[PDB]
Amino acid sequence: ALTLGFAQVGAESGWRTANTESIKSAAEEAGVNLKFADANGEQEKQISAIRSFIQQGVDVIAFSPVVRTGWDAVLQETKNAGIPVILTDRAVDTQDTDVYKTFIGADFIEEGRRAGQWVADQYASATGPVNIVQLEGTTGADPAIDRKTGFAEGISKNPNLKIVASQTGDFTRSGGKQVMEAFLKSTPQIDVVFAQNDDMGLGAMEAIEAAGKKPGTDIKIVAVDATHDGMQALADGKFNYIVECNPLLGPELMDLAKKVAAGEPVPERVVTPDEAFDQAQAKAALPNRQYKLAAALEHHHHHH
Amino acid sequence: ALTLGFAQVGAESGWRTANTESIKSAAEEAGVNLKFADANGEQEKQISAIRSFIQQGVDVIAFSPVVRTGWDAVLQETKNAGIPVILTDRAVDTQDTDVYKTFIGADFIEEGRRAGQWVADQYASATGPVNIVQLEGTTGADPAIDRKTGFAEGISKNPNLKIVASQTGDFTRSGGKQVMEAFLKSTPQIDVVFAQNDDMGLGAMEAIEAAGKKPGTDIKIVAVDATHDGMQALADGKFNYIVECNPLLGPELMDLAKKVAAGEPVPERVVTPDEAFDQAQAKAALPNRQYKLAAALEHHHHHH
Amino acid sequence: ALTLGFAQVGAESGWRTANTESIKSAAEEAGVNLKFADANGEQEKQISAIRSFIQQGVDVIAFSPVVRTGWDAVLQETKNAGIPVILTDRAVDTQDTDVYKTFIGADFIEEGRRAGQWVADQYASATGPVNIVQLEGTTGADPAIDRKTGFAEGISKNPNLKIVASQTGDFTRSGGKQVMEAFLKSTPQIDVVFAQNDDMGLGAMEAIEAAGKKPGTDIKIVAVDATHDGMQALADGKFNYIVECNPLLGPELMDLAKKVAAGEPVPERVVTPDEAFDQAQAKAALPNRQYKLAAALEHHHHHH
Amino acid sequence: ALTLGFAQVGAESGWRTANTESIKSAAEEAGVNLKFADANGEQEKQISAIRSFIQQGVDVIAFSPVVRTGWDAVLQETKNAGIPVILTDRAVDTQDTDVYKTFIGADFIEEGRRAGQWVADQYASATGPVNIVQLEGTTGADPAIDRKTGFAEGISKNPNLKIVASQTGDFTRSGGKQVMEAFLKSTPQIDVVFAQNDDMGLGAMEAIEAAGKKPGTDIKIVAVDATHDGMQALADGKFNYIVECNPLLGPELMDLAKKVAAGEPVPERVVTPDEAFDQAQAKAALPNRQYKLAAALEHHHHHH
Ligand SMILES: C[C@@H](O)[C@@H]1O[C@@H](O)[C@H](O)[C@H]1O
Ligand SMILES: C[C@@H](O)[C@@H]1O[C@@H](O)[C@H](O)[C@H]1O
Ligand SMILES: C[C@@H](O)[C@@H]1O[C@@H](O)[C@H](O)[C@H]1O
Ligand SMILES: C[C@@H](O)[C@@H]1O[C@@H](O)[C@H](O)[C@H]1O
Ligand SMILES: [Zn+2]
Ligand SMILES: [Zn+2]
Ligand SMILES: [Zn+2]
Ligand SMILES: [Zn+2]
Ligand SMILES: [Zn+2]
Ligand SMILES: [Zn+2]
Ligand SMILES: [Zn+2]
Ligand SMILES: [Zn+2]
Ligand SMILES: [Zn+2]
Ligand SMILES: [Zn+2]
Ligand SMILES: [Zn+2]
Ligand SMILES: [Zn+2]
Ligand SMILES: [Zn+2]
Ligand SMILES: [Zn+2]
Ligand SMILES: [Zn+2]
Ligand SMILES: [Zn+2]
Ligand SMILES: [Zn+2]
Ligand SMILES: [Zn+2]
Ligand SMILES: [Zn+2]
Ligand SMILES: [Zn+2]
Ligand SMILES: [Zn+2]
Ligand SMILES: [Zn+2]
Ligand SMILES: [Zn+2]
Ligand SMILES: [Zn+2]
Ligand SMILES: [Zn+2]
Ligand SMILES: [Zn+2]
């Protein structure tokens, strides 16, 4: 039977631990002998997992690139070993191809854009300036850059909206906590927080709590992911809006791995769907969430 | 309160009546004064419904064009009355600009492509020629033309697969029945039927039964829509593969109608998701179909 | 000075070589460093030409897509290199946004419609059925699909006219010849031939001659392009009707290449005019054809 | 043989006398018994010509509406007499239809837009304000309103450009002369003149001459039509840019009249092509102009 090697980022994230369960249990039903790597968020241990996959004679290799740059070498290596690659979740910035067989992930630019468009459509009648603080993702990672851009454009057509402060927090609760108290520190007027992942939004929520006033009413928070704790916080009113990012790639990852090993053809991009929730919708969405997320993913779409 | 005019094609198929239901009840519960016209499959009756919408001063107008061609005059008229137009499900082939504000529908080409690729993945080891028959949609309608193209491309890279017979059946059961009895006569070896809507496949299914062969095993059937009866046939083993086309535009149609009336900006295309089913998956998808469909639609995506 | 890359389809037809000439000499006289690739009718060779354009750092890239499908990856790549793209003559069916800056071509649907309506206006008093045979273009290319649709609609309101046989001939003389000898065998009564490019009509003309019937009077021919030899055949009475498709994009292609490179804004579609000819008009149009064609193109129109 | 009644505006214009020759001589070759009316630019004498056409038993009636409003009565009258109507050159603003069989004219909005886009692309680096004066067409006529709008949008994206003064001049030389000396009078800084027809541009040219400084260098003129004297003035350098409007409808008017009488079907809109000239291009365009214009019109396009 099939043997798949997967080189995962780390466990910075509730999304990432969800995603890791999806890959582990997905391999476990698909009948796939999975060999699984956690690079603790650092690129070179991921590349070493890759080389040890080539070095084991894996039939397929798949990973999610921590950040975009610096994979040419190891991708040409699997290139030459005869190892198909399947990209998951995050993109790589490479300039020679047939280095991999497909890329399955969300469209982060549009996640940012619909967060930005929510912000813009709330403050559509703000008489004066309305002040945005951005908790940014691990500098260099596909999602941080794309959500960066997309949210920028989403707020781009209401001139009252501008981002007063925005700096990186490594997609973490403690990161969001930390940068959120730095911005509590310097910025004196903060209306909305945009958290590139809702773990950082939860940390920032604690920082606002600690300063003594109320996430969800005084400072509004908008975040990306739709994690369990994200959604419970949104339902409780301490977030305002959350845009879904669907971590349950496991199963279509296994389908794709089988098709790429067997030499069946597979589409060049697979995009996972998203929706967004306000408070009420989140409180409706929680029941039987993992089932609903799996149906959501079965509704992915291809780019040909 | 808002008053919206909708000029529906007709009731040729279970998909169309599903969609008509979703629009009537969506207007009913978003609070919208709906004025609804049923053109009985005739373009000239749709156009005259539209003209009478203009003559009533409806605040938003929306329709689904029977065929791509011949709307120039009436769309310039709605432009010149100042009535925002929203397109639903089917495209128009127009030579004027900003004559409608957005278009919410499925990606018909990709539905055809995913059916054609199912045929290709089944007959990947076909010893000799494999004979496909195509039941085509209302000649002139967006979905028929696109589904033809996509299915053509999906089988396009397995030379054993060839479409020997292909003719229109007007998206109706009786049409598919009739064209299928003609195909049983003319073509002496029939391996697969590709039914552009699964209503025509149900007609063809009856024709196969009557002729003394067994649908789903002697002649395989692949179809588009995933209507109620489509899915029942698929679960009973009498179809082989169905690609979903999601009729429940009602609610997002109302969202868009409100914001274009209010002059809010809305994305220029809204694409409704799709999934495909084999027999087993068909039996699982049936249980809370209307709820699941509505969730699929809440996972749509924009083109901006 | 400016350097432009153009990836042409191939040389399947007199129209295509006409167009290739117009591009080479237009670049030569607008002062443009042209790098020109001939893909011999194969998509994968066009894509690789494009990738090598990126690898050369060309300032603008332009091509004409063999078929609508399968450019997602390479167009996102040109996007990500920052190379403006200009589409010429044939459309792409893409699921991404602003991946090209403008599209300059003819209106293929209307060419098909004007041929179909000529057939309809000729056989308006046909006593009984009138039998049409269609020679179809490269399955998958914009012009073939559109011309099919338009011709379908043009005959669509005279029930005597019916297309009994329709099959692809790859826009080549030998293709039309071959498919026409097949049509002479299978269909026993043939009144009209609709040749999606008049190269396939010249092939069919030879097939009619060889079979012992007289093109232009026994079997009538209607075709699209108005190539040199098309028009000669039309004037000799061996064709009956030709619709023009104007190959001389060279010069306006250079205009657009310069302004998109300079970052000037340019309209999103540029449509090249068409006219149709009977025998007499064919004999008049021949004399200063290249000059007249160039004037027709200077009368193009924009969609903004 | 056929009898056609045509109700022409008047003779305010070099374009209109050209157009009138086109209709008279076009009828004379097509074999059409034309009965021709000149309303001296005033609506009620045109409507009286119409009634006398109905009152004569004409087989077809065609006109060009001086201005958009006030034709409902007489169009319902020919409506009920059984007289097909063909619109030429100018549109009517009516709200009940099948009152006429087609409308053949130029797209005035785009004529204005490409004049505005020429202006905008010259003053692309103007360090400070650049000041536009508009000579407007007969208030109420399709072309005046549309060119109004189109030119507005063409200048719309260079903020240095604004129209300091713009008022009506009845599409006349004396009108342009008159309004041009009124604006010589009030506006103290005038860089460019936009003349909605180049007869008014010629009058304004004389007014500038008379004040003692130089059309074409100090005040630039841009006009619409491409009349004989317009083009000679542009070639002489006293205009800067002229956008073609093609008056030679005669022949396609006769084709359409025959098809509408015989009950053949005709497309619902016919759009006549345009190009624009700078000095050099005008000096190239003049030789054999009437022939070139006729070829231009044979390149019209339909809206279906
Ligand atoms: C979408 C993924 O790339 C992101 O990675 C995780 O660390 C974050 O929680 C997710 O948003
Ligand atoms: C996609 C829709 O336009 C189609 O219309 C109905 O007639 C068919 O069942 C659907 O597939
Ligand atoms: C319109 C063009 O794409 C077509 O390409 C050539 O192969 C044919 O002759 C033309 O009609
Ligand atoms: C286009 C026509 O409507 C206009 O009428 C004439 O008076 C002007 O010279 C033309 O521009
Ligand atoms: Zn949990
Ligand atoms: Zn979801
Ligand atoms: Zn696909
Ligand atoms: Zn898929
Ligand atoms: Zn109901
Ligand atoms: Zn139009
Ligand atoms: Zn057009
Ligand atoms: Zn047009
Ligand atoms: Zn479409
Ligand atoms: Zn049912
Ligand atoms: Zn579904
Ligand atoms: Zn969006
Ligand atoms: Zn939406
Ligand atoms: Zn040459
Ligand atoms: Zn894409
Ligand atoms: Zn899409
Ligand atoms: Zn997409
Ligand atoms: Zn097209
Ligand atoms: Zn030649
Ligand atoms: Zn021509
Ligand atoms: Zn333009
Ligand atoms: Zn142009
Ligand atoms: Zn003259
Ligand atoms: Zn011209
Ligand atoms: Zn036409
Ligand atoms: Zn015409």
Tab-separated table of N, CA, C and O in Angstrom, chain B residues 67-70 93-97 107 109-110 113 136 139-140 145-146 148-149 152-153 162 167 301 303-304, chain C residues 67-70 93-97 107 109-110 113 136 139-140 145-146 148-149 152-153 162 167 301 303-304:
chain	number	residue	atom	x	y	z
B	67	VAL	N	-31.787	31.770	-23.328
B	67	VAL	CA	-30.684	31.609	-24.261
B	67	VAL	C	-29.812	32.848	-24.164
B	67	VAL	O	-30.199	33.874	-23.602
B	68	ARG	N	-28.621	32.756	-24.726
B	68	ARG	CA	-27.701	33.851	-24.495
B	68	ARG	C	-28.104	35.080	-25.300
B	68	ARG	O	-27.882	36.211	-24.855
B	69	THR	N	-28.728	34.874	-26.457
B	69	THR	CA	-28.891	35.888	-27.491
B	69	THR	C	-30.227	36.612	-27.458
B	69	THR	O	-31.270	36.011	-27.167
B	70	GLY	N	-30.181	37.909	-27.788
B	70	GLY	CA	-31.359	38.684	-28.143
B	70	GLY	C	-31.971	39.532	-27.047
B	70	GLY	O	-33.193	39.688	-26.991
B	93	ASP	N	-25.393	37.015	-23.871
B	93	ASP	CA	-24.277	37.342	-24.760
B	93	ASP	C	-24.583	38.714	-25.342
B	93	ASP	O	-25.200	38.847	-26.406
B	94	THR	N	-24.104	39.734	-24.632
B	94	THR	CA	-24.443	41.118	-24.887
B	94	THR	C	-23.224	41.887	-25.365
B	94	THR	O	-22.085	41.643	-24.940
B	95	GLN	N	-23.514	42.895	-26.183
B	95	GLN	CA	-22.525	43.739	-26.826
B	95	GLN	C	-22.535	45.146	-26.233
B	95	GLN	O	-21.969	46.064	-26.838
B	96	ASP	N	-23.183	45.339	-25.075
B	96	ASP	CA	-23.208	46.598	-24.336
B	96	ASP	C	-22.660	46.411	-22.924
B	96	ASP	O	-22.535	45.288	-22.427
B	97	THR	N	-22.345	47.525	-22.266
B	97	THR	CA	-21.550	47.513	-21.045
B	97	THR	C	-22.359	47.979	-19.837
B	97	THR	O	-23.192	48.890	-19.929
B	107	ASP	N	-20.742	27.254	-12.358
B	107	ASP	CA	-19.748	27.195	-13.433
B	107	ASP	C	-20.041	25.977	-14.294
B	107	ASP	O	-19.486	24.897	-14.079
B	109	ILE	N	-19.222	25.110	-17.407
B	109	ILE	CA	-18.125	24.447	-18.109
B	109	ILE	C	-17.518	23.381	-17.216
B	109	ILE	O	-17.294	22.245	-17.645
B	110	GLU	N	-17.268	23.731	-15.948
B	110	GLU	CA	-16.573	22.818	-15.053
B	110	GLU	C	-17.447	21.638	-14.676
B	110	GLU	O	-16.926	20.537	-14.452
B	113	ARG	N	-16.905	19.398	-17.471
B	113	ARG	CA	-15.554	18.850	-17.417
B	113	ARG	C	-15.445	17.762	-16.359
B	113	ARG	O	-14.768	16.748	-16.570
B	136	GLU	N	-28.332	16.719	-25.122
B	136	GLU	CA	-27.937	18.121	-25.075
B	136	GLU	C	-29.098	19.005	-24.602
B	136	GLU	O	-30.275	18.696	-24.822
B	139	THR	N	-30.976	24.114	-27.145
B	139	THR	CA	-29.960	24.728	-28.003
B	139	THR	C	-30.093	26.238	-27.874
B	139	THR	O	-31.166	26.800	-28.119
B	140	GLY	N	-29.022	26.887	-27.428
B	140	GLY	CA	-28.992	28.327	-27.251
B	140	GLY	C	-28.802	28.788	-25.825
B	140	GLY	O	-28.443	29.961	-25.617
B	145	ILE	N	-24.467	24.892	-23.819
B	145	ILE	CA	-23.259	25.184	-24.595
B	145	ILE	C	-22.011	24.938	-23.752
B	145	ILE	O	-21.046	24.281	-24.191
B	146	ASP	N	-22.017	25.454	-22.518
B	146	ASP	CA	-20.864	25.289	-21.640
B	146	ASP	C	-20.662	23.834	-21.249
B	146	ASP	O	-19.528	23.348	-21.217
B	148	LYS	N	-21.618	21.025	-22.815
B	148	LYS	CA	-21.008	20.447	-24.017
B	148	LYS	C	-19.495	20.680	-24.066
B	148	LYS	O	-18.723	19.721	-24.211
B	149	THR	N	-19.055	21.954	-24.004
B	149	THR	CA	-17.617	22.248	-24.107
B	149	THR	C	-16.822	21.509	-23.037
B	149	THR	O	-15.804	20.867	-23.322
B	152	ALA	N	-16.722	17.745	-23.525
B	152	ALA	CA	-15.795	17.499	-24.619
B	152	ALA	C	-14.356	17.475	-24.104
B	152	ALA	O	-13.607	16.522	-24.347
B	153	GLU	N	-13.965	18.498	-23.350
B	153	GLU	CA	-12.583	18.529	-22.886
B	153	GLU	C	-12.275	17.418	-21.882
B	153	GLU	O	-11.150	16.908	-21.861
B	162	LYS	N	-15.326	8.145	-27.408
B	162	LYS	CA	-15.801	9.055	-28.440
B	162	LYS	C	-17.299	9.238	-28.395
B	162	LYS	O	-18.056	8.292	-28.144
B	167	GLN	N	-27.433	14.989	-29.339
B	167	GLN	CA	-28.535	15.801	-29.827
B	167	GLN	C	-29.335	16.377	-28.663
B	167	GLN	O	-29.275	15.887	-27.536
B	301	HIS	N	-18.389	31.753	-3.959
B	301	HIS	CA	-17.216	32.621	-4.032
B	301	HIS	C	-17.400	33.733	-5.073
B	301	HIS	O	-18.232	33.653	-5.978
B	303	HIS	N	-16.021	36.642	-7.955
B	303	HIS	CA	-15.053	37.208	-8.884
B	303	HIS	C	-15.278	38.716	-8.886
B	303	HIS	O	-16.403	39.174	-9.154
B	304	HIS	N	-14.209	39.475	-8.607
B	304	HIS	CA	-14.240	40.937	-8.478
B	304	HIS	C	-13.628	41.756	-9.639
B	304	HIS	O	-14.188	42.769	-10.087
C	67	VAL	N	-6.728	26.924	-27.424
C	67	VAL	CA	-8.002	26.512	-26.858
C	67	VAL	C	-8.252	27.357	-25.621
C	67	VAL	O	-7.360	28.026	-25.099
C	68	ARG	N	-9.482	27.320	-25.142
C	68	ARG	CA	-9.798	28.249	-24.077
C	68	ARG	C	-9.160	27.813	-22.765
C	68	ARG	O	-8.792	28.660	-21.945
C	69	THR	N	-8.986	26.507	-22.575
C	69	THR	CA	-8.702	25.899	-21.281
C	69	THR	C	-7.228	25.639	-21.018
C	69	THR	O	-6.474	25.271	-21.929
C	70	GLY	N	-6.837	25.809	-19.749
C	70	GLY	CA	-5.580	25.297	-19.226
C	70	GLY	C	-4.425	26.274	-19.155
C	70	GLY	O	-3.272	25.888	-19.358
C	93	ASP	N	-10.416	30.760	-21.070
C	93	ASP	CA	-11.495	30.554	-20.104
C	93	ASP	C	-10.828	30.395	-18.746
C	93	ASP	O	-10.503	29.285	-18.307
C	94	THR	N	-10.664	31.533	-18.075
C	94	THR	CA	-9.879	31.644	-16.863
C	94	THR	C	-10.770	31.979	-15.679
C	94	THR	O	-11.763	32.713	-15.791
C	95	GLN	N	-10.322	31.502	-14.521
C	95	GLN	CA	-11.021	31.629	-13.257
C	95	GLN	C	-10.302	32.602	-12.326
C	95	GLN	O	-10.589	32.618	-11.124
C	96	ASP	N	-9.359	33.399	-12.852
C	96	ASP	CA	-8.648	34.441	-12.117
C	96	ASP	C	-8.846	35.803	-12.779
C	96	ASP	O	-9.277	35.901	-13.931
C	97	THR	N	-8.513	36.864	-12.045
C	97	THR	CA	-8.908	38.218	-12.407
C	97	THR	C	-7.702	39.084	-12.762
C	97	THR	O	-6.629	38.980	-12.154
C	107	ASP	N	-15.468	39.175	-33.445
C	107	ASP	CA	-16.641	38.632	-32.754
C	107	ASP	C	-17.087	37.373	-33.479
C	107	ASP	O	-17.951	37.416	-34.358
C	109	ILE	N	-18.945	34.749	-32.600
C	109	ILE	CA	-20.355	34.364	-32.568
C	109	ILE	C	-21.087	35.011	-33.729
C	109	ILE	O	-21.846	34.353	-34.448
C	110	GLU	N	-20.845	36.310	-33.942
C	110	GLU	CA	-21.593	37.046	-34.951
C	110	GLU	C	-21.196	36.625	-36.352
C	110	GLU	O	-22.037	36.655	-37.262
C	113	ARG	N	-23.277	33.703	-36.860
C	113	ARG	CA	-24.671	34.103	-37.009
C	113	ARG	C	-24.931	34.685	-38.390
C	113	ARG	O	-25.985	34.435	-38.988
C	136	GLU	N	-16.216	21.725	-38.588
C	136	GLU	CA	-15.995	22.392	-37.310
C	136	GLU	C	-14.500	22.630	-37.065
C	136	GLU	O	-13.642	21.870	-37.529
C	139	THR	N	-11.459	21.422	-32.026
C	139	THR	CA	-12.329	21.299	-30.854
C	139	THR	C	-11.579	21.862	-29.656
C	139	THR	O	-10.472	21.414	-29.339
C	140	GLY	N	-12.151	22.886	-29.032
C	140	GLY	CA	-11.559	23.532	-27.875
C	140	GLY	C	-11.180	24.979	-28.079
C	140	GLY	O	-10.977	25.693	-27.080
C	145	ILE	N	-16.041	27.112	-31.213
C	145	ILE	CA	-17.187	27.028	-30.304
C	145	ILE	C	-18.171	28.162	-30.579
C	145	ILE	O	-19.394	27.951	-30.696
C	146	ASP	N	-17.646	29.387	-30.700
C	146	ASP	CA	-18.504	30.540	-30.945
C	146	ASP	C	-19.162	30.467	-32.314
C	146	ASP	O	-20.347	30.783	-32.455
C	148	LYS	N	-19.835	27.808	-34.246
C	148	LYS	CA	-20.908	26.831	-34.040
C	148	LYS	C	-22.162	27.468	-33.434
C	148	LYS	O	-23.261	27.330	-33.991
C	149	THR	N	-22.027	28.123	-32.261
C	149	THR	CA	-23.204	28.706	-31.597
C	149	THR	C	-23.926	29.688	-32.512
C	149	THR	O	-25.151	29.635	-32.672
C	152	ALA	N	-25.636	28.051	-35.480
C	152	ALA	CA	-26.830	27.403	-34.959
C	152	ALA	C	-27.976	28.407	-34.846
C	152	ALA	O	-29.078	28.179	-35.359
C	153	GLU	N	-27.722	29.549	-34.215
C	153	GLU	CA	-28.809	30.506	-34.047
C	153	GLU	C	-29.268	31.113	-35.372
C	153	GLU	O	-30.457	31.408	-35.531
C	162	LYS	N	-31.674	22.074	-41.564
C	162	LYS	CA	-31.156	21.309	-40.439
C	162	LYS	C	-29.751	20.812	-40.685
C	162	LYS	O	-29.396	20.409	-41.800
C	167	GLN	N	-18.771	17.901	-37.924
C	167	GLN	CA	-17.600	17.317	-37.290
C	167	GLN	C	-16.370	18.187	-37.529
C	167	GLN	O	-16.331	19.009	-38.443
C	301	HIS	N	-13.614	48.792	-32.811
C	301	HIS	CA	-14.322	49.487	-31.738
C	301	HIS	C	-13.982	48.897	-30.363
C	301	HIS	O	-13.511	47.766	-30.232
C	303	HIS	N	-14.774	47.958	-26.221
C	303	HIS	CA	-15.639	47.739	-25.069
C	303	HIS	C	-14.841	48.152	-23.837
C	303	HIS	O	-13.735	47.630	-23.611
C	304	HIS	N	-15.411	49.071	-23.044
C	304	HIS	CA	-14.769	49.658	-21.862
C	304	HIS	C	-15.278	49.184	-20.480
C	304	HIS	O	-14.495	48.918	-19.553
